[PDB]
Amino acid sequence: YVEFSEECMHGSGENYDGKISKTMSGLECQAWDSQSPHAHGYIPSKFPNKNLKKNYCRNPDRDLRPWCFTTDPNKRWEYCDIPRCAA
């Protein structure tokens, strides 16, 4: 997370709930319950057990890896690279 941190994740980030609201490309993540120009069909009211809070990057569809929407007119959404377990 920081300059010096070797945290261990499960593997696919599918069950990970970190306080990450930014992308690797400096792009800010859009808020889940906030209706931004970028329309989203992932309504938290239909996913209260997915911990859809604030604007943190999560894996709501059980995808290959977590992803989040972006408040950038050129990038609707992007994937998030999180350290995977090699043990």
């Binding site: 069909g41 992932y42 009211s45 239909k46 996913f47 209260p48 709501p60 569809d61 609707r76 959404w77």
Partner: protein
């Protein structure tokens, strides 16, 4: 819908298809800006590469 999470799995599955049609549409969107890049020599092959 608002207070119930009934049939969430099905809605979620459909949303996945929506993201697929959207993210892949974005490819075409970018290609709209410059078609030369899109269909002619290198960029397509490079940008796409391989995911799955």
């Amino acid at each position: 819908g608002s207070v119930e999470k009934l049939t969430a799995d099905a809605e979620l599955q459909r949303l996945k298809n929506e993201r697929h049609e959207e993210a892949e549409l974005e490819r075409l969107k970018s290609e709209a800006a410059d078609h030369d890049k899109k269909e002619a020599e290198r960029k397509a092959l490079e940008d796409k590469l391989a995911d799955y």
